Ligand binder design. Sequence first.
Ligand SMILES: Cc1cc2nc3c(=O)[nH]c(=O)nc-3n(C[C@H](O)[C@H](O)[C@H](O)COP(=O)(O)O)c2cc1C
Ligand SMILES: Cc1cc2nc3c(=O)[nH]c(=O)nc-3n(C[C@H](O)[C@H](O)[C@H](O)COP(=O)(O)O)c2cc1C
Lengths: 386, 386
Amino acid sequence: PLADTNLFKPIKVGKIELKNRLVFPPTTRFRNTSDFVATDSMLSYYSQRAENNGGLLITEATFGAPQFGLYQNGPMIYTDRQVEAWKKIVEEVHKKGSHISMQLWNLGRAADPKLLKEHGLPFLAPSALYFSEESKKAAEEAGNEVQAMTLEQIEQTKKDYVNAAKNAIQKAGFDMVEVHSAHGYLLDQFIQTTANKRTDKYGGSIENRARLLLEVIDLVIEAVGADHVAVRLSPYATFQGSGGVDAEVHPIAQFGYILSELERRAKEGKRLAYVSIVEPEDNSWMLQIWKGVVLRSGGYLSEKGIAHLIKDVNADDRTLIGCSRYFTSNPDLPNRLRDGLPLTPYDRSRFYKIFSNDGYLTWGKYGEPEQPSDSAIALKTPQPLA
Amino acid sequence: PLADTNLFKPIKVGKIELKNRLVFPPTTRFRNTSDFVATDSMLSYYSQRAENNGGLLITEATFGAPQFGLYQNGPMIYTDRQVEAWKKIVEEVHKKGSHISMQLWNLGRAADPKLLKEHGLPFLAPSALYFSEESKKAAEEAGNEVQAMTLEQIEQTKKDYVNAAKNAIQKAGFDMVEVHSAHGYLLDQFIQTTANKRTDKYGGSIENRARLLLEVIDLVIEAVGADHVAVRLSPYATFQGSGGVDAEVHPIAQFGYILSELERRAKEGKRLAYVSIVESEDNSWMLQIWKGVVLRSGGYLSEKGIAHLIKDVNADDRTLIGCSRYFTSNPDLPNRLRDGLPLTPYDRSRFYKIFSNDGYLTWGKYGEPEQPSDSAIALKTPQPLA
Ligand SMILES: Cc1cc2nc3c(=O)[nH]c(=O)nc-3n(C[C@H](O)[C@H](O)[C@H](O)COP(=O)(O)O)c2cc1C
Ligand SMILES: Cc1cc2nc3c(=O)[nH]c(=O)nc-3n(C[C@H](O)[C@H](O)[C@H](O)COP(=O)(O)O)c2cc1C
């Protein structure tokens, strides 16, 4: 039972008032159309998690533009249809009494090179380096080999971030827009020494490696306001060739500088809505630098993560707790954690089941059974919302 | 009783085998002659602190050269008489079975401008900034105003560090030489954004502000070897205008970069003898970055620090514990801490009493009385060891 704790104490984030501090972190599921349009399945998916919640939801990582991708059946906030669909999802989430932020995705050297090629797009990264020999062979066989971004492509990346942020906040009505700068995707690639060998002002130092992220953040803040902006960082992660603690420059220095710059912008009157961090190594130093709302995610609902949930959410008055994997299998997770009711185990084998309701909408509420793989919803084909 | 803890477990530091991990941190006392030569009182002082100890003694912050000073009756390892006196002290310390390091001092904008003036020396800093209006005042009346160092004064500084290091290690026989890069003196002034406004290679970035320290470190490494070199850092200190956590760039990023670079030199086969550190402020990130011997100092004997002493010294097998203020009172502090014997209180009013044995050699070992100020030892005028 966690109703006793700060986890269900209201908190002001940005300009909105969250009823609790439990967050659904961005969780990629690939239930969009092949056109990258949000579906009715996704609408019900976020609707059930906005019901009886009052808290914050964060969308699956969403491509800001075609060049920001691509993965098959991923999300996008680019075309008119996509913005319409996401707008309807937002309107339903708000009707439910919850709030929602959209995380913006940019793959970089992590993208599907064949799909990008079929959409006539190059395969871009800070430097012409692959994170694995597997990816190198994949890009070479697709005829779409990785390229170091030109200055023009970086400028276009910034403009695309601005356009996607405006579409999310102003057209679709999201409460925040979250810049995905973690897990070895494009912005992280610019941050990481392992991925960034550039010798212009976007590489070669801590300030230079963090430059693209900070410029995107500044342009987006100018576009939609700091209280509608967020960012996610993963200093210790080694996913997709990121250096973690093994980087030639320690992540405490690099990401320490990033956090210092965000806190400086906050000291100049541009305070981000929140900074999202992944629990491992210890994140305490991060909380030393950033003084605003911090969303901490990872492990908190395991058979040992509990009582670090209590400790961390009660440690101060600015901490949000994110639970992703159990939120996928528990659409009523806020009430189950509120009342201390047993959780439904999550099923990793259906995390990325492309364009299928099986393991996506088959989960029941507390005390209700899991619908089987041959049920009506499990075999119903998702339909685009616009 | 602390004999059971790691505080009294042997440990290898550099080439040296320390029988315990209690350390006498560098403690300025100003009992040298007016021409900065070590003194017989100092020999008896360090000698008493070397008996029944076997630990590491760290010498009072010592001027590497006349330009590195100046303070009244401060120490220096520049002239042949000075090196010979310090050699006598080192021979006595080794004879008594303990080991000793010399900390090298460079005042910069913290110096006495009147004294420097009287020695025909300028008043140097990274930038033409005083740490206080009082210092500005004393400098302007002595007609020795602060000057931003030229490139050749920087080069001469590094050469002087090399010369002082070779003097201490190879001639005087010190076990290691510690570079003072803390508490707002010259190297810290280069590190701090509050004091370093340089636009050249030595300022305007994390890497640029740390450049002089790392260059000096590398040169001294080349001179005397890595296991004969150490460094002290005070990321949180705000002494003499240092920025602390209020710096434009957070000290976790800056000193995080410094520690990452030192650990990088360790990865390449040049592992410093130890890193000396001072102390939501918390030095845990420092231990996340630096993996070698770390000497932690500050406040460890308050009956609120005894627990932090046991905790920090037992947390791993590479932690030394420094105790300065109580070591000034208890020349047999190793035995007292080893057997839980009550400590003689310290007298700050005689910490900096110039050229006097009173409150310097009047301390008795456990079970003996403090000699009064009219005793034979207290009235003696100290003589140079030359
Ligand atoms: C299937 C799946 C998809 C995810 N997608 C994203 C994503 O798109 N963006 C992101 O920042 N994190 C993503 N994550 C990481 C989660 O947001 C979260 O940080 C991680 O699962 C740890 O939290 P947890 O222990 O509560 O599950 C994903 C995780 C999973 C399991
Ligand atoms: C009188 C006095 C002189 C000191 N001189 C130096 C010095 O020359 N160099 C230095 O790095 N620290 C110096 N320190 C700081 C100590 O080395 C130590 O970090 C500080 O006193 C905290 O340790 P403690 O709590 O055990 O006393 C001095 C401290 C005192 C009280």
